[PDB]
């Protein structure tokens, strides 16, 4: 005791990203 | 490079991985041929190993979700966040889910599949993002280019920061990313646009306001996916709101973010000859409408108003602007000087007095 998983999850997960941009804008 | 915090690493070197669905937009085949082209690259340069597991439960769980679909975290539909992935770890840990409420492709199109799998697993081999554009390791997808695949060095060298090397890379050059720094440092395109320099060299170029001393870091393929990744030279017609690119014998016409109608066009149709395989650099003259082509030792002078070579072209370069050698890297003109860029040397050219006024390293356009 105490039971518990210490490292239960992960905040550490990280995303790529492509940004909605948009073409023909003069 | 960037690990995760406490340095999260497998400490098995064969690990197992699963595709538990798959997008519909690929085959079967295809969506696996991507994943094993997608670990191959990490392990290409890593003690590691990967086995695809065929059921049951493997490190590195691979699915495609829509919207939310399992973990806290959401996807967000068509575009913008593509996939995520764990660090490494017990269950959770390792996996990684894409998208698929994305076109995922093999090509040009939609988002290759296998790209962002190369990135994503990543993650789940303990690299954290990258600050350098030039990493796959990047925060932001760009599609790097229908030519093959190479692993970044900055990639590399964190990754083996972990476990690296192995015995046999198939191809140990990998591309570093330029230093603005480096006094060897030589340009291969520069214009204006918008009133920021542009600055090019190789699958890169440095955008710098007047305003600004550090320049940022684009990829070329960033803003012009159609774009070749190393480019011969770049001019600019700032009135009329455009900038013109050269590759080989190809030269393209962009107002911001497109090109125009009908480009590429040959540089034949700027009435160049055959023999002429590249423009080496480029300046145009706003005052007088007619811009400079350089190849070689030579130089031409084409009229970008009336839209014809100059009469009594080509000329050499060593006579119109003697002192700077016999070759032109890149140039470009401001407020009566010209800078012309032979290997890691500037030269300040003055149209005035008509010859070099000051004479410094190339880099020194990039403040250092
Ligand atoms: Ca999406
Ligand atoms: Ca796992
Ligand atoms: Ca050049
Ligand atoms: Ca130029
Ligand atoms: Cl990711
Ligand atoms: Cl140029
Ligand atoms: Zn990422
Ligand atoms: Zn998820």
């Known amino acids: ?26 | 490079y960037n690990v995760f915090p406490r340095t999260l690493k497998w400490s098995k070197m064969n690990l197992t991985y699963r595709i538990v669905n798959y997008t519909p937009d690929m085959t079967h085949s295809e969506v696996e041929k991507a994943f094993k082209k997608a670990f191959k690259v990490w392990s290409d340069v890593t003690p590691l190993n990967f086995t695809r597991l065929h059921d049951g439960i493997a490190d590195i769980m691979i699915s495609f979700g829509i919207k939310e679909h399992g973990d806290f975290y959401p996807f967000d539909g068509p575009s913008g966040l593509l996939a995520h992935a764990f660090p490494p770890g017990p269950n959770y840990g390792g996996d990684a889910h894409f998208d698929d409420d994305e076109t995922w492709t093999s090509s040009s199109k939609g988002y290759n599949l296998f790209l962002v799998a190369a990135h994503a697993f990543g993650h789940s081999l303990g690299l954290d993002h990258s600050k350098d554009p030039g990493a796959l390791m990047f925060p932001i997808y760009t599609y790097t280019g229908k030519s093959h695949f190479m692993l970044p060095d900055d990639d590399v060298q964190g990754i083996q920061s972990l476990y690296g090397p192995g015995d046999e890379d198939p191809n140990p050059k990998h591309p570093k990313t330029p230093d603005k720094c480096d006094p060897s440092l030589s340009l291969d395109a520069i214009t204006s646009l918008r009133g920021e320099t542009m600055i090019f060299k190789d699958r890169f170029f440095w955008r710098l306001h007047p305003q600004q001393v550090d320049a940022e870091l684009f990829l070329t393929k960033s803003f012009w996916p159609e774009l070749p990744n190393r480019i011969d030279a770049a001019y600019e017609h700032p009135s009329h709101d455009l900038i013109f690119i050269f590759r080989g014998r190809k030269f393209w016409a962009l107002n911001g973010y497109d090109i125009l109608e009908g480009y590429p066009k040959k540089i034949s149709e700027l009435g160049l000859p055959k023999e002429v395989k590249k423009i080496s650099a480029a300046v145009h003259f706003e005052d007088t409408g007619k811009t400079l082509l350089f190849s070689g030792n030579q130089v031409w002078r084409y009229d970008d108003t009336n839209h014809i070579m100059d009469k009594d072209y080509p000329r050499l370069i060593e006579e119109d602007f003697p002192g700077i050698g016999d070759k032109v890297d890149a140039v470009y003109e401001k407020n009566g000087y010209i800078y012309f860029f032979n290997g890691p040397i500037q030269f300040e050219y003055s149209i005035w007095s008509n010859r070099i006024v000051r004479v410094m390293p190339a880099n020194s356009i990039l403040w250092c």
């Open chain 1, 1 to 26: 005791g105490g039971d518990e998983d210490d490292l239960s999850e992960e905040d550490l997960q990280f995303a790529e990203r492509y940004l909605r941009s948009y073409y023909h804008p003069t």
